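Exercise (ungraded).
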Amino acid sequence: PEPINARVIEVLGRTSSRGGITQVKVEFMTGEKRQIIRNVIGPVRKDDILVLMESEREAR
Amino acid sequence: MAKGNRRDLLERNDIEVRERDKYTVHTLGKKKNSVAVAFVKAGKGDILVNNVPLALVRPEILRTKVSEPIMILGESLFKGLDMNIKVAGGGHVSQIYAVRQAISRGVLASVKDEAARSELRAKLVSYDRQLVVSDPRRCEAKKFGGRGARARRQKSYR
Amino acid sequence: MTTIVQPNDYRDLLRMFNTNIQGKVVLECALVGIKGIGRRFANVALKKANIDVHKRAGELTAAEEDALMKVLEDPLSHGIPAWMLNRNNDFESGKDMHILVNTIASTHRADLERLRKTRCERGVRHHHNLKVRGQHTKSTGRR
Amino acid sequence: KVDYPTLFADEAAMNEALKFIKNSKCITHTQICERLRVSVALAKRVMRQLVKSGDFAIVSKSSRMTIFKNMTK
Amino acid sequence: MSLEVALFNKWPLTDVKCQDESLEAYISIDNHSFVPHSAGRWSAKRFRKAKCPVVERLTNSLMMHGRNSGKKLMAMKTVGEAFELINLYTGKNPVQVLVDAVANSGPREDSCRIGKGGQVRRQSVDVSPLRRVNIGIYNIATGARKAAFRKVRPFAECLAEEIMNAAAGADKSYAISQRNSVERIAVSNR
Amino acid sequence: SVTRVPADVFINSFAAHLKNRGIIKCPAFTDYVKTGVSRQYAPRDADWFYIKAASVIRHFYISGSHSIGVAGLARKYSSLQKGKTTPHHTKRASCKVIRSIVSQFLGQKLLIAGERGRHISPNGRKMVEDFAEGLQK
Amino acid sequence: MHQKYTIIVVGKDLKLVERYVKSIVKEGRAFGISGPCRAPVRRLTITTRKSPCGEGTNTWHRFELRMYKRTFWVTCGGNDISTILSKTVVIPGIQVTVEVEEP
RNA sequence: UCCAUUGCGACAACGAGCGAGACCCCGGCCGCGGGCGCCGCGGGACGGCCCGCGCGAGCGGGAGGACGGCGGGGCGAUAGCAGGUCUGUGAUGCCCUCAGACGCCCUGGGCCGCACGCGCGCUACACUGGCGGGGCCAGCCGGCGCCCGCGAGGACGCGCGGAGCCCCCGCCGUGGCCGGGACCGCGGGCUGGAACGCCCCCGCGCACCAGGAAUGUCUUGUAGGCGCCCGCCCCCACCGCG
């Protein structure tokens, strides 16, 4: 219910047609070290912080 | 009305010659089509543009932009000496930046211990780099395809 | 000016030359509501009258209303030049006059009457509704 | 649509135009226009009268915009 | 330090920060000159605008309209007026309010066209800090721009009201409404 | 000197002094003119003549020994013509007013002619500096 | 004896005009002549349609003619009427570089 | 791998060439000389240095530097189109005109004519504004004084010279109103052999409240906004090259 935030460890490059979206590998600095995947729109770089309204969702 | 390359300017034949020989230093600043010539000497903290003091300039909003080097560098140095800049070229803002560049270089040309000069250069460039290095970009020409450098006349396929 | 509260005689709507004028607009602009008057003519008219120009029109006392009227039917004699008049060399009088609302319709309507009998090129085009000047009409002004 | 005057009648230059602003802390010509539904010029005149009194002080002045503060509180 | 850059020679930048962490570093609050007019050749690299002083970013969007193109002096004057108004209503530093507002706007989710997505198949995705700040700024400026067209009151008052409301998070403001609409519609597609 | 004060204060103060001293007088034609083909309506103020005169004498002082003609003064009071469904263009002011002002100033010997145009005389410099210092504080 | 003379030089190529100069100045060291005053370049410009008719895309030619000018007037008293010819002969006459003289 | 048949490494192929790049003009930084007037000759930047990778060619990041990785233009391969041009020419083949002439010259008129469909543009829909006064800076480049006349312009006489936006002070105060200036009615002037052409003054004061289906251009001194010079030209720029 309470959106958390995740930090970027790396980047997996553009995927979506017409560019834009980029896959990413994040981890929860909430303390669980859950390395997962997500998609992002807009310029992004390493160490950036995202806001995830989902404690749990998967893409690929 | 003044081109910025005229011999009368880089020499400053405006000043009377007997006093001219006192202004040991010379300097230059620019931006776009705008030139600044600072003849500097010893004084008690005074400055002038085209026979105008520094406070009573037209950028009532950018007066601090002109004064920046004074505040970032301190006051005793500028109080030490005196100036009389002249400027000529396109626009108002261009002239403002030309002037501030000229002031920075001229005051920084006065010291004699190059270690102090380096320390001051480092202190100053940190705040901004364009107070010491001229801006290169300049107006780009236009082409006959349309009425602008890169834009083109609107094309109708039907 | 510096007038906050309304003058006891402040008149909210004024009538002149069969035209009605408001009492909240400034005087020089209000008079523009009439036909035959504009901004340039008006100031040159009020000023000769020793009238102020930045006073709301409704607060114009009655005495000023007449003298203002007097200098408007008798412009030239009061001094105003002959190049500030809407009618400079009348066809019959040869005079220099300034004509107003009751007259514009007649002097104009009577002008075209003279052009039809004279058979000028201009008069005919005033009939079928074309352009009297030399404007091109192939692709413009399409009703 | 909306009509506004430019000339108070006697008592409206006191019952509201003044009595109602003095409570305010910061005011402006257009604010007082939209509040009292009267055109701006009258607001300029009245504010001049007030600074003449001394209840308000200018903080930022300019042809486009000048604003005041209520010192009297 | 040696000098404090009192903005417009009134309000300082000392005890100022941002609460949110995601965009804390994408907001420059310390390299403000006395006047938000720098000839910096920003927008040259890909991430250099993240160092532009936030206020200059703000003013550079107030002259977006075609008629008002190339007019920065009026923009600086407008911004100064708005800052005085904010100080007079709130009593605190307007810069704090501006940063809080830019943080409280900006969507945290938006819909895009991923893969083939035939037949309007739009998935949901999260958003990067830079786009968040950009959209927040653009929304504030556009909201103030929409209120003051063919209206009596000036642009500055609308600007300041919008900014304070957004800092409050009230739905009454235009930016907050836009953000909520976008977030919700994207949730539908998630 | 004079350039150590903004023009706005100096111009108005000098014009008031001038009107008080009767140095120059508004002729009749000053009350129906529009001041330039560019301009659209006539001036609002009733004492613009004196302001213009003050500005002109200040301009003659600035140039010092250099000479100015009337038509060269008209190009410093130009503007932009509008209302023609056509791109705007720049136009020169009228020179009758300027001629009146310079002729009156010269009649008072504040302004000595040369080969071409006219240039300030030392009396004019004396007076201008005197008032400049008078308003300095 | 003494007359205060001027030398004009005109040309469209920069090489000969920079070669005539060296010869003349080398020849005049004794008579007291001094270097030139390189004058502003005169730029002739013509834009013409690249086609003899209106067709296709509208493409333009941009022709120009540069004219260079060097002026030695430093002979004067150092050179008399007859001695001027001494200087206008030893130089290497070039087929196109009009040089005019006028006190 | 490269923007690029640009390169590395192989192969019944070996060895070459054009095109590309190289090249020329412009500008940015520095040096020398010369000088009525800023104009002549040179230097400088090369994927050179550090770090990663990659046999390699080369890719990503960081430095110092005026400029950092094809900065803007010109030239532009083989082959071809029934593309346009006989109305540019003492460039032209074949036909037709050739003494009541399609030859050449003069007088008037037309190419501008208007119920209508659209292509490139200009002006506006206003307060991020309009009006009045004042202050003030460009570059391709460049001519001024005195006197009359509101102005446009005019009579004399000499060689001398730069604007809009913008900033400041005030008026207006949401009203198709001082926004907008089309249309039309007297008048004063210029050009020219001759106004149908062009300017100035007073008056009148059309639509127009951001524009549907459709669609165009654009990545740094760029878009957009503002104005200024030349071309044709007896007068005339909402056009075009800059």
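Further reading is listed at the end of the chapter. For now, observe: The longest strand of chain G covers residues 60-72. The radius of gyration of chain G is 19 Å.
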